[PDB]
């Protein structure tokens, strides 16, 4: 499920009138058409931050797995964080990060190497050349991973009790028995085929890693979000080369070519084209942000129910009779293991 | 906002320019104001869609938390939900989720089952818990120890397949009578 | 109301020069002057304005007296001490109520602080004043608005400024205005209670963009920051041969319009001063370009079509024009980028007994599409005769521009030439006479590479520019690399510094300290830019070495990084949150604390069961 | 005429509406009126 | 409950410029104001 999108802070002054005093002065004739767009993008960025906060920051106290890891036979090494890795992420969590490629990290501070780009300057340098930047998320993908580690350790050592109040430790075999009892099968079934169910759990967990490894893209939703954002941004920057019926598409050119009282007409045409394109971008971003907010509210509900407890609602937390759910952080989204 | 017209006042540029002169400026003002109004309408549509999403969420919350007990965790407030009370607010609703939250807890001990005589006993409902020397059965969200009797537990097993079983004596109210 | 204005105001906490008296320096005047003084009864009469204060340029005088004023506009000579000695070409006298007012409470203790503001915006000399009976001994710091008194459309040139003195037997507070944005708080009675500048402090700018006087705790995106260029480089090609404009202009047999001689101009430097010199201009109307800005442009190719035509026909020659010349003789294309030059030539196209050498076409089978010559003598058909000859119904197509030294203005032999340029993307062989400065790399500069204007940072490259390649771009069609015309090397181009400034402040009811965050920029770059004073932002927030923090989200100035971890109070980005914490109070940034570190007591047979319970009512909105 | 919908041409400021006495505190140089959204609110009567 | 709406796939090129080469060339100067709309409606149909 997607949880957030790339945060942008479009500045219309630089985007529409690159360091042009005359263009800025003519833009002031359009009223507060700009502060609206800046405010809308600010609201979208704050909304993305709130979405990630709702989805992941569900547990006030950060829990940790016990130093020893023997959960009655259940093998959780695939979703528990790896101390060896510098990033401290799960093996199944690493695959998602390596299977999603962000066009612009935002947290690069790439200025200084656009001159050093040597080759053709890339999308990020081009976007910086025309007032189009990306803010980074408030929650880094390292502390989000620690939120997910806390959520996972809370559901394997304390069952669902930590989702209500104080986290009460309970052996995993007994938690399994209680989840089973929650769907109408008595505990004796689990306590009589504990080894078999542990083997099935280990096999399923192991074979989901390969199912994600070998598949072309099962994360098509998150990559879809990333592609949609990058593609909207690329269409935005591509509108800077459209004449819109003017003599030329370069403000510095038509300013250096025509004297002000004549160039005002062409600059006005450029304003009325670029403002319309920017408003199109802002409206599409608002619609996508509403969709992503709906998806993130759904993901937060799914976390709060499937993870912090057993859900009696059929087919909501995966297909079949739900038992638990282990969240795993993904780039601009969350991945559940029902 | 002039929008690139001579002036931003309709009654002015009408009284200051004959129709042909005013027409062009009037067209500029119309194309500016109409565009601003479309922006406002689109923002209102998006905000109304968001508010409708929030209102459907509120309606679901009312129908579940208020008119009943919700078994879904962290939906009707944090903790085990008990009941809710709506409160009308300006352009919205305010809920008072009354929630049951546990408190002070004690390590005791636990075992999946109790083997009395070659047969495994499991709790009918609740946990098998131990003071430290006398095994007990009790509910899950409250410590109410009870003597382990044949009605508190159901027997199914062979005392050899359950991992973690503990030797203890169960009680039956029929042998005495 | 919290109305926001943009006009000339004295910048807050700016420089004001305080004078004394016991000779009378001539203060320069520009963009308005803030004037203030504090005297016992009267020692300052008025002011003198104008340029050079002599009998060659109009000047001003606003001398006051006991009962009225003496505002006038004249060309006085001097007084070197009545107040002048020349009123020859002098008008626009003016008399009204005296500007100075003095009241004393039976004691000379009160010294009214008189403040004045003047300006000369589109003429209309504006004067503002306000007398505060408060003794101004120590320049007061409370707010006091200024009311206009008079406003007279003077319409002269004012650069210098002086003042007058009184006779007898601590004042002169002067400041200079600047174009700044102000936010003004209007009282319920219509007066102004408090105003805040919008280019002084990060707090002031946030307060401006969040129009209010109380800014709640949070982070506000206000503006952006840009490294303004320091040097401006222009790199024009390695050619110095002046263009052949002289040859075509110094010609005498300018061909007729039916055969418009078209010369190609390339591989030369076009200095249009020679265009001006051999030209008693009559019509220099230019379409694609401004004739003023012609020495700073580079054109791929320049055409010059020369043809002598009649008086009305020059106003008849233009892009997509019509008529006997603009339809069958010479038609300029609609999207013409260039212009026409026309000057009377009655000495070279005339002689006694008359001259009929020139020609012009009146009869063509159809319209002439732009830029076509139609040299041909075919008799125009009328009716349905294939007639080949002259007479009636058989007309020789082209008629004669007979020229003699005696015609009216509508008929004199106007010498018309047109210049057509191609201002598109391609190596320009023709450029203006602008000198080629040196090349500076790794420094934000304005470049004019072969007429390609822009701003950014340039440096060496490891591209594989093919020999014919001249430009660079990206999938977004933005000029990336430019080959140096005089070095034949590849230079990448960088954004200037473009970023984004977000001010991080707690509520103004708490403290005035703020934290500034420049988005997506290495803080070394903004530090050198600040030290070079090339940053567009003018609010120079302090940097003591302890308030700099290269965040993953930009860099933070004005907050010190603490290695502790607290709850997130003001979100910054990338796991950083700012808050106002005690030391004795300052702003600190820290990596957010996700929660209290807890470890569960999981074991094979250990379980936790709550022996008690609580009822908590939470609220959801 | 006050308290009646009229078309006004106050000193070249055209418009329509209803006028009445106010308790404003117009400064002696004050001539026009407005509001937060910059719309003409009050006009000083040229002949009164 | 509605589950889907009509899947529309308007083409801007014809909708604005009915088989007019001049209008197509003038539209080309507006950049990718067309591919955006086509992609948006295609996404809408796929989502339906
Ligand atoms: C839990 O599951 C892990 C899966 O990664 C097991 O790790 C394995 O370690 C062996 C080496 O002994 C590797 O060959 C194998 O590929 C895998 O990495 C781990 O042993 C297992 N532990 C328990 C207690 O079940
Ligand atoms: C095991 O649980 C017993 C509860 O019945 C506790 O024993 C009690 O001990 C008192 C005397 O100390 C008796 O009077 C009472 O009837 C009861 O048997 C006992 O404390 C508890 N064990 C531990 C270690 O707490
Ligand atoms: C529970 O009690 C059983 C008998 O009451 C024990 O079984 C015994 O097991 C031993 C071997 O450990 C045999 O030698 C003996 O004959 C008898 O079968 C059982 O071990 C015991 N379990 C625990 C955990 O105490
Ligand atoms: C706006 O102007 C009003 C008219 O003068 C002021 O009301 C006056 O208040 C004084 C006391 O300060 C009274 O003596 C007088 O009768 C009248 O009520 C009002 O205060 C003023 N408001 C401001 C300046 O904010
Ligand atoms: C237009 O008239 C120009 C000036 O007479 C011509 O330029 C010159 O032409 C002479 C030959 O008459 C050359 O010797 C000289 O070098 C220069 O080019 C130009 O050719 C002429 N063009 C046309 C198309 O008639
Ligand atoms: C469970 O928790 C209750 C409150 O959380 C306890 O009630 C308290 O009772 C004492 C008097 O014994 C009061 O002073 C206090 O204010 C509170 O009301 C209750 O005793 C407690 N019960 C157990 C078994 O722990
Ligand atoms: C259970 O015992 C462990 C072992 O030290 C301890 O850390 C934990 O706090 C105990 N839990 C209780 C007493 O609730
Ligand atoms: C005003 O001038 C003094 C004298 O040099 C200077 O010290 C001070 O910094 C100036 N004010 C400001 C705001 O720079
Ligand atoms: C002051 O100026 C007025 C302006 O004309 C003049 O009439 C008058 O004589 C001057 N002197 C006094 C004392 O008023
Ligand atoms: C006023 O200006 C005219 C301008 O030609 C000049 O001739 C005349 O001498 C001037 N009057 C003087 C100097 O008194
Ligand atoms: C005003 O005076 C200044 C100073 O000499 C001069 O540079 C400027 O060109 C003048 N302007 C006009 C309009 O005379
Ligand atoms: C031709 O050149 C001579 C050189 O002395 C110059 O005097 C004359 O004005 C020129 N004629 C034209 C039409 O440029
Ligand atoms: C430019 O011209 C100068 C002078 O002729 C010459 O020394 C230099 O090598 C030239 N550079 C190039 C790149 O042609
Ligand atoms: C940005 O970060 C630091 C601080 O300036 C320095 O290493 C260099 O300027 C940049 N480094 C990289 C890797 O871009
Ligand atoms: C305290 O902060 C400094 C950086 O200011 C850091 O190098 C150091 O490791 C921190 N100490 C602790 C105990 O976290
Ligand atoms: C749980 O049992 C396993 C296997 O019997 C053992 O390796 C582990 O140390 C035990 N842990 C505790 C806390 O009893
Ligand atoms: C307007 O003029 C008339 C006639 O001069 C006079 O009676 C009246 O008082 C004047 N009113 C104002 C407000 O100037």
Author numbering:
A (entry chain C): 727 to 1064
B (entry chain A): 968 to 1144
C (entry chain A): 47 to 68, 80 to 138, 158 to 210, 212 to 246, 263 to 482, 484 to 677, 689 to 726
D (entry chain B): 534 to 581
E (entry chain B): 727 to 774
Give verbatim excerpts from the published study on this entry:
The dense glycan shield consisting of 22–23 N-glycosylation sequons per protomer is an essential feature of SARS-CoV-2 S architecture. The glycans have been shown to play intrinsic and extrinsic roles in protein folding, modulating conformational activation and immune evasion. The transition to the ‘up’ state exposures of RBD for the binding to hACE2 is also a prerequisite for S-mediated viral fusion, directly correlating with infectivity. Here, we dissected the role of N354-linked glycosylation, acquired by BA.2.86 sub-lineages, as a RBD conformational control element in attenuating viral infectivity.
To explore the putative acquisition of glycosylation at N245 and N354 in more recent variants, we determined the asymmetric cryo-EM reconstructions of the BA.2.86 and JN. S-trimer at pH 7.4, to mimic the physiological conditions at atomic resolution. In contrast to S-trimers from most variants ranging from WT, D614G through Alpha, Delta, Omicron to XBB and XBB.1.5, which sample the RBD-up conformation more frequently (>50%), BA.2.86 and JN. S-trimers dominantly adopt a closed state with all three RBDs in the down configuration, similar to structural observations of VAS5, a highly attenuated SARS-CoV-2 vaccine candidate. Notably, the N354 glycan resides in a cleft formed by the NTD and RBD from two neighboring subunits, and establishes hydrogen bonds with T167 of NTD and with E340 of RBD, respectively, acting like a ‘bolt’ to lock the S-trimer in an ‘RBD-down’ state. Remarkably, however, recently prevalent BA.2.86 sublineages dominate their S protein in the RBD-down state up to 100% for JN.1 due to acquisition of the N354 glycosylation, shielding RBD from neutralizing antibodies and preventing RBD-hACE2 engagement. Compared to FLip and other XBB variants, BA.2.86 did not show substantial humoral immune escape, while JN.1 with one additional mutation (L455S) on BA.2.86 became more immune-evasive due to extensive resistance across three types of antibodies.
